[PDB]
Amino acid sequence: TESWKLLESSIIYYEGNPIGTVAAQDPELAALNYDQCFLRDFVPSAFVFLMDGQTDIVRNFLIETLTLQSHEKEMDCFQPGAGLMPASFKVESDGSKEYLVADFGEKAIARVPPVDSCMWWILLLRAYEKATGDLTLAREPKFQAGIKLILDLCLAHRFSMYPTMLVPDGAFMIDRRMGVYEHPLEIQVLFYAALRAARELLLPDGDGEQYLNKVHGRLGALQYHIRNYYWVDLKRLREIYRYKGNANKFNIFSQSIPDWVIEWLPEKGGYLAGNLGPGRMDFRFFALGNLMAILAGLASEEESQRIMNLFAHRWEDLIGYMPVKICYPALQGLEWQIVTGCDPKNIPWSYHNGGNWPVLLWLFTAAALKTGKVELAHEAIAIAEGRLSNDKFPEYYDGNNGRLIGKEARIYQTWSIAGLLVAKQFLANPDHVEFIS
Amino acid sequence: LRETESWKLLESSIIYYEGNPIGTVAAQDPDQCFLRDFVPSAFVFLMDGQTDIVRNFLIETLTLQSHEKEMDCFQPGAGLMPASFKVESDGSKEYLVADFGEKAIARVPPVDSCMWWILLLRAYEKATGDLTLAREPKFQAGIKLILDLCLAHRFSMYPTMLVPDGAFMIDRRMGVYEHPLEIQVLFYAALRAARELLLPDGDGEQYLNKVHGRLGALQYHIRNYYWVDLKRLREIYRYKGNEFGKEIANKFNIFSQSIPDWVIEWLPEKGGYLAGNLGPGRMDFRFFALGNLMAILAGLASEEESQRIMNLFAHRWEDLIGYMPVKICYPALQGLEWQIVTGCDPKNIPWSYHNGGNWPVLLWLFTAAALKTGKVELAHEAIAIAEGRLSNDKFPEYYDGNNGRLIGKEARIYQTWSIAGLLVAKQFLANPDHVEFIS
Amino acid sequence: TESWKLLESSIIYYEGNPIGTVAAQDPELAALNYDQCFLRDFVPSAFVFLMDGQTDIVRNFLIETLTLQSHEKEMDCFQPGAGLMPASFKVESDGSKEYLVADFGEKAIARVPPVDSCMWWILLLRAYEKATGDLTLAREPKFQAGIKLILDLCLAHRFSMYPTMLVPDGAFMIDRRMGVYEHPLEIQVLFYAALRAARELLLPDGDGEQYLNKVHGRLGALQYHIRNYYWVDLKRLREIYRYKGNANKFNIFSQSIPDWVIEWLPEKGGYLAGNLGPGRMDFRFFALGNLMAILAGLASEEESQRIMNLFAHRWEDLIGYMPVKICYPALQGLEWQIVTGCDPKNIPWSYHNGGNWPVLLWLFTAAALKTGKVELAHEAIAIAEGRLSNDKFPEYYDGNNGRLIGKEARIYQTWSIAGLLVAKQFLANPDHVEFIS
Ligand SMILES: OC[C@H]1O[C@H](O)[C@H](O)[C@@H](O)[C@@H]1O
Ligand SMILES: OC[C@H]1O[C@H](O)[C@H](O)[C@@H](O)[C@@H]1O
Ligand SMILES: OC[C@H]1O[C@H](O)[C@H](O)[C@@H](O)[C@@H]1O
């Protein structure tokens, strides 16, 4: 079919071998960095290849990125943690020899750190092991060392009383300044998910035993903290609205609860908030964080049900014309200005700021399946299928309900293409959902 | 239909000049004849068969054109028609006095008045069968003088007609300057009429050549650049800014971030409309009813395009028709935009008058367009709504509010074209062949 | 000196001959259309060459543009008036042959019409005749025909009761949407100035006699209308503020007089307003319109004095760090949005919207000289000289007082360079001011 053929065209070969897929195949626009392979972008590609049985590419991807981990990465005589995985890479030729060049954030726009990338790497490594049955790769000293360098960076002692992870703005899939600084849901959910993965991956050698305990320790803390403090429902909103200023551990002034939240939430709906920090709660709903919370089992069974109840009751908002809304609602007017620095790629209901992202369909489908809401997966896929092909698989969609093709969206965006495929594969064989859960 | 209340108010409205009927007053609110206002009145009379008044009207208004008018030490184009005229008595004789814009509030020029004159002449012709009138040397000269002004050479590459703000039914500053839809549509319609009405005799062939050239360029321009639907909207939203060259998509440099949020949500999948205005760096996305409805009747819109406009009305019935047909334009300018665009004009406050008001007269255009596209149920529902209020409300000039719940703030009562509007619409409904006069 | 050498480098040769100067010599930025010769840009260049005695270039410029007038210009099967001069032109090669390509507005951004260009052409033709003493050029049938085609376009009967000229937005030096639609001062002043020029240029043959009368007729009307209706001073503001709604011929609601105007105007200051139309008066101050009104003698003697009194009392606003402010004040916030269509090149105090333009120094100097305010010319030139060279002659400056180098300004902008030169030439020999007056 059309989609498989596009996916194969996106494949990047290195020394005769396939090692990844390009971000997009848009002929008209500037190559920019979309000719590169992004670690976060490759995940849904990997899943298609894993399910198809052609696993070489995923193995090689993991081997090459592990080697990139060891590359030299710096800006102005300062090195980040050694475990840092890159945002993306591409294949360059100096005459006859081929070599890999990575962007670890020293080339990236706004110099954002690709914090979710080392998380996805660990998750994908686990996904690869479960899908193939190849235990050989994770056992090697190289990979054990690489997992450990990541954990060193994650579990490093920081100035905080909480087990969450502190990041600058634009740390995850949202790579632009969007007020997702401090402790955004996505990073915490993926952090948790990566810690869970690390348990089966870490060999319990003398050194490893030290790591597994730290992992198990943080997993517990992290789950308590996210479920008790990030969780939002009407019951919880009533509690927060009545809190005293200066029980409230984060000093939330109830006048700082938005109007829209109260009217938006159905009685049986709920979700994990976007962010938590001193004097601050981000009541914006972030899709990927919430769906992965379901998949990774971070959310409880009821909480998972309440999230899908929320998608059901607020379908136009969160799915509309193109699944899935990245976050809701959009920053608008002056708020857009202060929070994003007048970032013109993120105008209201566009891109990170309220846009609709096809790739997220694969997470929505998995999470719908895990919670038994099959009808919702059918409808979301039906919606996506009706437009994507005709629209040439746009990177994103814009507007309250995703009616517009994204303002600066690239066409033939690989994870949009891969997102649809993976969602159809899950629908055909729901047991494959185990790989991401 | 002559026994009915409306007809009686219409007969009362008639102005007489030396024992001859020449027009109708704007209102009988407890005055003078506006050229644009007379059109619906004329339509009722012609269908009923009283044509002497329409004929006399065209004669008298043609004579006024030749009158010498000036502002200060400068005189404007010879072919300019007046906004209105009235009968002032010497005491010993009756004579006609005209307002060509030199007496008008805001000193605006009535461009549409000339348009409507030509259209009414054709309307006269096609209803009576009388060809003699338009063929008279006087009328040929009159038509030509109007064409001289419309076909005035331009500095720009736009085949549209350049005008100042408030140059049509909206006679007050409303941000309708430059290239407003209504004017372009009536311009097109006036050119069409000029194809039949003009004689190739003498200088006639030279005029027909300029007319035919413009009709094509103008039709192409409006359909390709003013037309708005989701498909087209998606293209514009993805335009890159600051494109320079002969072959480029964004010829008018529209910045997508400037496109309002309401438009995206307002359009139905199967609906569409022609934009309010188009100029350098600007697109007015406001829906304008008279321009859009005339674009259907004059055949300026294609068949599909005409269907897609009526789909919009149906899908957005409360916004466009609501309590009183028909919303003059949507949406209202509000807050700081109303200030900047209208100059804090207290008569055009949000959802009032020109700025989002509902105007009875527009019902006849809506009915005509409904019939022509075969959506009769819409004309019927529209007439039903209007019929239920007007008589009781004493036929107000317009209505105010998002949906026209309020009677117009400064609306005149017993407004003639409000009355005529309803009569015309009913006459079209009874005999849909009468729609051929404006098409 | 540095400036002469830069000016010569800008010179454009055609078939071995110099025919004009490029807009800018900025190496780093995209060539765009700044590699072209703009008719409005060439004027201050021409003046330098006229004063230097090397006049060939100006003669050839006029001959070539006259030929361009006769070129085919259209968009979508519609032709503008035959007299339309182009915005700009450049030299192209098809192998060995060289040919001229013009932009008449069918290539221009936003499709703006270069209405001021045919005006400057006539003015420059007159300037050339007076400076050189060459009466040969304007007498030729070609040039008489060309002047006449322009007049046909200008004096064409339009739907208006006034003698002013109706234009779309972006018709003059301000080539972007800036609320200068309808009847902007600049067009009216230049129109007047061009009509005055046409009197000495038009041969009084049988055909010409018909033209001269129309010219003389319009000159009178136009001057009355501009002086009586556009003129602004406190006396006039008091009159307008007390006007009744619905004496007031343009229906100006006194609540639509801005606050800033009243406080801004000194007792002995005055100016010609930016625009006049139905229900509308643009109280913004536009520099070029006002200065040319002085030069062309459109303004009276006292009115000219009151304009310079205004520059003197409001020097920081209108001159500040870089002469001269193009218009004051800037459109801001929401007003910028509605009026300019969120045009990012025209953000507040930037470019057309409140920017400071070096080129305008040559008009300021001429107008200061004509009115006897020599000290003001010295100071304005002193100010300009201190920055321009070091800044590499930026196209424009930004900010309330022109502290910033213009946001997207090109460097080595020819009319910035030429502007300074012409202003120094005028200061050295004030009798040369006659050429533009
Ligand atoms: O498609 C590759 C990249 O595109 C954009 O930069 C997205 O914001 C980022 O999340 C993605 O990884
Ligand atoms: O009824 C006479 C006039 O009334 C109002 O002024 C309307 O704005 C105008 O369109 C109409 O022609
Ligand atoms: O410098 C050439 C051109 O540059 C910019 O486009 C200016 O707005 C314009 O006035 C000038 O003619």
Side-chain angles (χ1 to χ4, degrees):
Chain A
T1 62
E2 188 200 20
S3 304
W4 289 94
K5 295 173 179 182
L6 293 165
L7 185 56
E8 184 176 339
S9 312
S10 82
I11 294 186
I12 301 162
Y13 294 89
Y14 176 63
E15 293 176 334
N17 291 297
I19 61 159
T21 51
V22 295
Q25 279 176 119
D26 184 355
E28 289 170 321
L29 291 177
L32 180 55
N33 45 0
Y34 277 63
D35 64 322
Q36 303 193 55
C37 172
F38 288 75
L39 280 65
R40 77 172 60 87
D41 278 63
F42 184 69
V43 167
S45 296
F47 277 45
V48 176
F49 297 126
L50 288 180
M51 260 157 248
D52 189 63
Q54 49 187 272
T55 70
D56 286 329
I57 183 167
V58 181
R59 188 183 191 266
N60 299 321
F61 171 89
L62 292 163
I63 296 168
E64 296 300 347
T65 49
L66 180 55
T67 305
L68 290 176
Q69 194 189 36
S70 77
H71 280 25
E72 292 302 321
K73 63 197 86 156
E74 69 171 34
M75 184 178 76
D76 299 322
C77 297
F78 169 78
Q79 293 178 31
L84 179 63
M85 286 291 168
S88 63
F89 65 86
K90 55 174 169 179
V91 177
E92 301 281 55
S93 293
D94 181 344
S96 178
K97 73 162 159 183
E98 276 185 319
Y99 58 108
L100 295 184
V101 177
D103 172 12
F104 292 86
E106 83 272 25
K107 294 169 175 67
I109 307 177
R111 292 303 185 257
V112 290
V115 177
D116 62 338
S117 293
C118 63
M119 319 276 207
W120 278 119
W121 187 86
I122 288 173
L123 289 171
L124 178 62
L125 177 56
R126 188 216 194 202
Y128 166 84
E129 177 173 294
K130 280 163 62 160
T132 66
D134 171 18
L135 322 175
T136 297
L137 202 68
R139 303 281 165 96
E140 297 184 337
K142 294 183 197 296
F143 282 86
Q144 289 288 306
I147 293 160
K148 279 170 194 171
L149 291 173
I150 296 169
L151 293 184
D152 291 323
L153 197 46
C154 290
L155 302 170
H157 289 313
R158 154 218 295 105
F159 278 100
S160 197
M161 286 270 183
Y162 348 109
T164 46
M165 191 150 126
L166 194 66
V167 297
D169 215 329
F172 46 103
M173 187 192 157
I174 290 179
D175 53 7
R176 293 179 91 96
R177 188 189 172 199
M178 271 280 305
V180 299
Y181 61 90
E182 225 163 47
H183 318 270
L185 183 64
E186 185 153 323
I187 293 291
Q188 316 311 322
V189 176
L190 292 174
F191 178 28
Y192 177 79
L195 289 175
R196 265 173 52 81
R199 293 189 307 194
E200 293 86 46
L201 294 175
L202 281 161
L203 286 168
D205 195 348
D207 187 47
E209 186 174 350
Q210 308 302 125
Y211 276 97
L212 282 157
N213 291 323
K214 288 174 170 181
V215 171
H216 172 86
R218 186 70 77 107
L219 273 179
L222 200 52
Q223 176 158 235
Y224 180 94
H225 180 94
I226 291 162
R227 294 195 56 238
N228 281 285
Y229 301 119
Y230 283 66
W231 181 254
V232 172
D233 56 23
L234 273 169
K235 173 175 151 73
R236 182 81 197 167
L237 282 179
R238 285 179 192 117
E239 292 170 11
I240 303 171
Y241 187 75
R242 281 167 60 76
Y243 297 147
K244 307 214 162 203
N246 307 328
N248 202 166
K249 306 172 196 62
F250 303 90
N251 205 14
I252 312 304
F253 293 90
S254 66
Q255 62 263 35
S256 84
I257 302 180
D259 287 296
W260 68 262
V261 189
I262 300 144
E263 296 206 319
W264 196 64
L265 270 180
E267 197 174 292
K268 298 298 187 181
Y271 68 105
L272 290 162
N275 213 311
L276 187 68
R280 192 196 178 209
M281 189 156 167
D282 187 0
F283 287 88
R284 285 181 299 176
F285 170 87
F286 286 83
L288 192 151
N290 274 285
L291 297 171
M292 275 291 300
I294 291 170
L295 298 169
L298 175 45
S300 65
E301 294 296 339
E302 194 189 331
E303 286 159 358
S304 301
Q305 293 300 319
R306 292 174 83 95
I307 285 163
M308 301 295 315
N309 289 2
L310 174 59
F311 278 94
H313 185 278
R314 292 307 175 195
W315 189 263
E316 294 297 354
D317 290 340
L318 303 175
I319 299 289
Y321 295 101
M322 180 45 77
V324 174
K325 175 77 64 193
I326 196 170
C327 67
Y328 173 95
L331 299 172
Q332 309 216 54
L334 195 70
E335 198 171 10
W336 164 74
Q337 293 183 22
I338 289 147
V339 172
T340 79
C342 291
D343 186 335
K345 190 163 190 180
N346 269 321
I347 64 178
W349 303 114
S350 188
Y351 212 45
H352 304 313
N353 197 23
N356 293 42
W357 292 67
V359 61
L360 299 175
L361 180 52
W362 80 264
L363 295 158
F364 181 74
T365 300
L369 289 166
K370 186 175 212 283
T371 60
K373 317 282 174 150
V374 180
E375 59 280 349
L376 300 186
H378 285 298
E379 182 56 24
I381 296 161
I383 289 157
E385 256 179 342
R387 296 180 71 190
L388 283 182
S389 191
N390 297 329
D391 289 352
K392 292 172 169 210
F393 298 90
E395 179 184 5
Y396 62 100
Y397 284 73
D398 286 357
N400 293 67
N401 306 109
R403 260 198 161 174
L404 299 155
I405 300 163
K407 175 178 149 52
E408 304 181 26
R410 273 149 190 91
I411 55 159
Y412 300 120
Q413 185 76 20
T414 311
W415 70 353
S416 283
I417 298 152
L420 183 56
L421 285 172
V422 181
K424 289 163 73 67
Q425 286 179 335
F426 283 156
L427 204 64
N429 187 1
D431 285 31
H432 287 336
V433 175
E434 295 303 335
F435 307 152
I436 190 50
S437 59
Chain B
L1 281 74
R2 301 133 88 186
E3 303 157 29
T4 66
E5 181 205 20
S6 290
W7 173 266
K8 283 201 175 69
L9 287 161
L10 185 63
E11 186 174 335
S12 312
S13 72
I14 300 180
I15 310 163
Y16 290 89
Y17 180 57
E18 301 167 333
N20 284 322
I22 61 166
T24 54
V25 300
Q28 286 173 101
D29 180 327
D31 57 327
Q32 44 181 343
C33 183
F34 284 77
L35 277 65
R36 79 174 63 87
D37 286 59
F38 185 59
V39 172
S41 299
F43 281 14
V44 177
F45 295 133
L46 296 175
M47 272 175 256
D48 185 50
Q50 183 184 337
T51 69
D52 289 298
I53 180 166
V54 179
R55 185 178 199 277
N56 296 341
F57 175 82
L58 293 163
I59 292 165
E60 297 298 342
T61 54
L62 172 54
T63 299
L64 288 176
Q65 191 189 43
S66 75
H67 281 211
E68 290 295 22
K69 56 283 187 176
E70 63 183 343
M71 179 148 156
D72 298 305
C73 57
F74 166 81
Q75 64 172 17
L80 176 54
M81 294 272 171
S84 57
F85 67 86
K86 49 174 162 181
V87 183
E88 275 182 16
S89 289
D90 200 314
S92 165
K93 76 170 174 182
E94 291 185 356
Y95 63 110
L96 302 172
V97 172
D99 172 9
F100 285 87
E102 95 280 20
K103 293 277 182 67
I105 304 170
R107 284 305 186 273
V108 293
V111 177
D112 67 327
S113 290
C114 302
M115 310 305 194
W116 282 116
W117 184 84
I118 293 176
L119 290 172
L120 185 55
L121 179 58
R122 174 185 174 145
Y124 168 75
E125 180 164 298
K126 286 167 56 161
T128 63
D130 182 12
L131 314 180
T132 67
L133 196 65
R135 293 286 182 95
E136 287 189 12
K138 292 188 182 287
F139 281 80
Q140 289 292 307
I143 293 160
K144 279 170 185 161
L145 292 175
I146 289 168
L147 289 176
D148 286 327
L149 285 172
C150 300
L151 305 176
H153 284 299
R154 294 207 53 182
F155 279 94
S156 69
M157 303 288 172
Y158 297 84
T160 44
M161 195 182 152
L162 187 63
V163 290
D165 215 324
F168 48 100
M169 202 189 158
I170 299 172
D171 49 9
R172 300 180 76 97
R173 173 178 173 194
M174 264 288 304
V176 291
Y177 61 91
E178 218 159 72
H179 309 135
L181 178 63
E182 178 157 326
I183 291 289
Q184 311 322 318
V185 176
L186 294 174
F187 179 27
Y188 180 82
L191 290 171
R192 265 178 58 83
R195 296 180 320 189
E196 287 91 32
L197 297 168
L198 279 169
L199 290 168
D201 182 15
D203 194 344
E205 194 188 17
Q206 312 299 122
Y207 274 94
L208 285 160
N209 267 320
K210 288 180 170 87
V211 169
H212 270 104
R214 202 68 169 265
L215 269 170
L218 182 59
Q219 177 153 227
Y220 178 96
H221 185 80
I222 288 159
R223 287 192 61 235
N224 283 292
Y225 304 130
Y226 284 61
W227 183 253
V228 170
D229 52 25
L230 283 168
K231 178 171 157 66
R232 183 82 208 291
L233 211 57
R234 288 178 184 123
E235 292 170 3
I236 298 164
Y237 188 74
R238 277 166 67 74
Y239 281 161
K240 288 185 175 173
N242 300 330
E243 288 194 304
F244 170 76
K246 201 176 187 178
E247 316 295 342
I248 63 160
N250 200 3
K251 294 171 183 64
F252 308 102
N253 208 17
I254 308 309
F255 292 94
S256 54
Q257 60 266 30
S258 78
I259 299 169
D261 305 75
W262 70 261
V263 183
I264 321 307
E265 289 204 313
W266 195 64
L267 276 171
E269 206 172 285
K270 300 289 181 181
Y273 68 102
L274 287 171
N277 211 314
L278 189 72
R282 174 205 191 198
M283 211 160 158
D284 187 7
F285 283 96
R286 282 179 303 174
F287 176 86
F288 281 87
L290 193 156
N292 274 278
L293 293 169
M294 274 297 297
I296 298 171
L297 304 169
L300 172 46
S302 72
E303 291 290 341
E304 190 189 351
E305 285 161 357
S306 302
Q307 295 296 326
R308 291 184 80 95
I309 286 162
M310 298 295 311
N311 284 332
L312 180 51
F313 277 96
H315 196 250
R316 298 297 169 203
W317 192 262
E318 295 299 332
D319 287 342
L320 302 179
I321 302 296
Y323 293 110
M324 170 68 184
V326 174
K327 182 74 69 187
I328 186 169
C329 73
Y330 174 93
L333 300 170
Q334 307 210 58
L336 186 61
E337 195 171 12
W338 160 76
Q339 295 177 26
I340 290 159
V341 178
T342 79
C344 304
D345 185 327
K347 188 166 193 178
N348 271 319
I349 54 161
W351 304 115
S352 184
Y353 210 39
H354 298 138
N355 196 23
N358 292 47
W359 292 65
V361 60
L362 300 177
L363 180 61
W364 80 258
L365 294 159
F366 182 67
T367 301
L371 292 177
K372 189 176 206 285
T373 63
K375 308 300 173 194
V376 190
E377 61 274 21
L378 301 189
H380 187 69
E381 182 52 38
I383 288 159
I385 294 160
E387 225 165 19
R389 303 182 62 181
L390 287 175
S391 188
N392 291 317
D393 289 356
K394 289 187 172 186
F395 294 102
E397 181 190 353
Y398 62 97
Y399 290 74
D400 290 7
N402 294 57
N403 304 112
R405 281 180 196 190
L406 298 161
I407 299 164
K409 188 183 57 151
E410 312 190 28
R412 287 157 192 102
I413 59 162
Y414 298 122
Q415 185 79 23
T416 308
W417 68 350
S418 295
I419 299 154
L422 181 61
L423 284 172
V424 172
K426 294 169 76 61
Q427 290 182 339
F428 284 160
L429 203 65
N431 186 8
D433 294 347
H434 288 325
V435 176
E436 296 290 3
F437 310 148
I438 198 57
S439 64
Chain C
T1 62
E2 188 200 20
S3 304
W4 289 94
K5 295 173 179 182
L6 293 165
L7 185 56
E8 184 176 339
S9 312
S10 82
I11 294 186
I12 301 162
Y13 294 89
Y14 176 63
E15 293 176 334
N17 291 297
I19 61 159
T21 51
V22 295
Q25 279 176 119
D26 184 355
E28 289 170 321
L29 291 177
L32 180 55
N33 45 0
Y34 277 63
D35 64 322
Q36 303 193 55
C37 172
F38 288 75
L39 280 65
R40 77 172 60 87
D41 278 63
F42 184 69
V43 167
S45 296
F47 277 45
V48 176
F49 297 126
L50 288 180
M51 260 157 248
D52 189 63
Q54 49 187 272
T55 70
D56 286 329
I57 183 167
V58 181
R59 188 183 191 266
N60 299 321
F61 171 89
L62 292 163
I63 296 168
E64 296 300 347
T65 49
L66 180 55
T67 305
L68 290 176
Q69 194 189 36
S70 77
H71 280 25
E72 292 302 321
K73 63 197 86 156
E74 69 171 34
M75 184 178 76
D76 299 322
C77 297
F78 169 78
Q79 293 178 31
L84 179 63
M85 286 291 168
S88 63
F89 65 86
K90 55 174 169 179
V91 177
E92 301 281 55
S93 293
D94 181 344
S96 178
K97 73 162 159 183
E98 276 185 319
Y99 58 108
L100 295 184
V101 177
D103 172 12
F104 292 86
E106 83 272 25
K107 294 169 175 67
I109 307 177
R111 292 303 185 257
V112 290
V115 177
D116 62 338
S117 293
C118 63
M119 319 276 207
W120 278 119
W121 187 86
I122 288 173
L123 289 171
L124 178 62
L125 177 56
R126 188 216 194 202
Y128 166 84
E129 177 173 294
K130 280 163 62 160
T132 66
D134 171 18
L135 322 175
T136 297
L137 202 68
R139 303 281 165 96
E140 297 184 337
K142 294 183 197 296
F143 282 86
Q144 289 288 306
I147 293 160
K148 279 170 194 171
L149 291 173
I150 296 169
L151 293 184
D152 291 323
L153 197 46
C154 290
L155 302 170
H157 289 313
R158 154 218 295 105
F159 278 100
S160 197
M161 286 270 183
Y162 348 109
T164 46
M165 191 150 126
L166 194 66
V167 297
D169 215 329
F172 46 103
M173 187 192 157
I174 290 179
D175 53 7
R176 293 179 91 96
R177 188 189 172 199
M178 271 280 305
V180 299
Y181 61 90
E182 225 163 47
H183 318 270
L185 183 64
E186 185 153 323
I187 293 291
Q188 316 311 322
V189 176
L190 292 174
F191 178 28
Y192 177 79
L195 289 175
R196 265 173 52 81
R199 293 189 307 194
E200 293 86 46
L201 294 175
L202 281 161
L203 286 168
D205 195 348
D207 187 47
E209 186 174 350
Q210 308 302 125
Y211 276 97
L212 282 157
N213 291 323
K214 288 174 170 181
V215 171
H216 172 86
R218 186 70 77 107
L219 273 179
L222 200 52
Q223 176 158 235
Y224 180 94
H225 180 94
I226 291 162
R227 294 195 56 238
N228 281 285
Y229 301 119
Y230 283 66
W231 181 254
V232 172
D233 56 23
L234 273 169
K235 173 175 151 73
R236 182 81 197 167
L237 282 179
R238 285 179 192 117
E239 292 170 11
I240 303 171
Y241 187 75
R242 281 167 60 76
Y243 297 147
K244 307 214 162 203
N246 307 328
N248 202 166
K249 306 172 196 62
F250 303 90
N251 205 14
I252 312 304
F253 293 90
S254 66
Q255 62 263 35
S256 84
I257 302 180
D259 287 296
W260 68 262
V261 189
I262 300 144
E263 296 206 319
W264 196 64
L265 270 180
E267 197 174 292
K268 298 298 187 181
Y271 68 105
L272 290 162
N275 213 311
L276 187 68
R280 192 196 178 209
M281 189 156 167
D282 187 0
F283 287 88
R284 285 181 299 176
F285 170 87
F286 286 83
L288 192 151
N290 274 285
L291 297 171
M292 275 291 300
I294 291 170
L295 298 169
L298 175 45
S300 65
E301 294 296 339
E302 194 189 331
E303 286 159 358
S304 301
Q305 293 300 319
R306 292 174 83 95
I307 285 163
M308 301 295 315
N309 289 2
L310 174 59
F311 278 94
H313 185 278
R314 292 307 175 195
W315 189 263
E316 294 297 354
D317 290 340
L318 303 175
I319 299 289
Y321 295 101
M322 180 45 77
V324 174
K325 175 77 64 193
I326 196 170
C327 67
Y328 173 95
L331 299 172
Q332 309 216 54
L334 195 70
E335 198 171 10
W336 164 74
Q337 293 183 22
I338 289 147
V339 172
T340 79
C342 291
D343 186 335
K345 190 163 190 180
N346 269 321
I347 64 178
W349 303 114
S350 188
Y351 212 45
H352 304 313
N353 197 23
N356 293 42
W357 292 67
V359 61
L360 299 175
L361 180 52
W362 80 264
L363 295 158
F364 181 74
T365 300
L369 289 166
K370 186 175 212 283
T371 60
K373 317 282 174 150
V374 180
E375 59 280 349
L376 300 186
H378 285 298
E379 182 56 24
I381 296 161
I383 289 157
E385 256 179 342
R387 296 180 71 190
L388 283 182
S389 191
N390 297 329
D391 289 352
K392 292 172 169 210
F393 298 90
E395 179 184 5
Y396 62 100
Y397 284 73
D398 286 357
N400 293 67
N401 306 109
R403 260 198 161 174
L404 299 155
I405 300 163
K407 175 178 149 52
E408 304 181 26
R410 273 149 190 91
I411 55 159
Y412 300 120
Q413 185 76 20
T414 311
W415 70 353
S416 283
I417 298 152
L420 183 56
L421 285 172
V422 181
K424 289 163 73 67
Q425 286 179 335
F426 283 156
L427 204 64
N429 187 1
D431 285 31
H432 287 336
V433 175
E434 295 303 335
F435 307 152
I436 190 50
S437 59

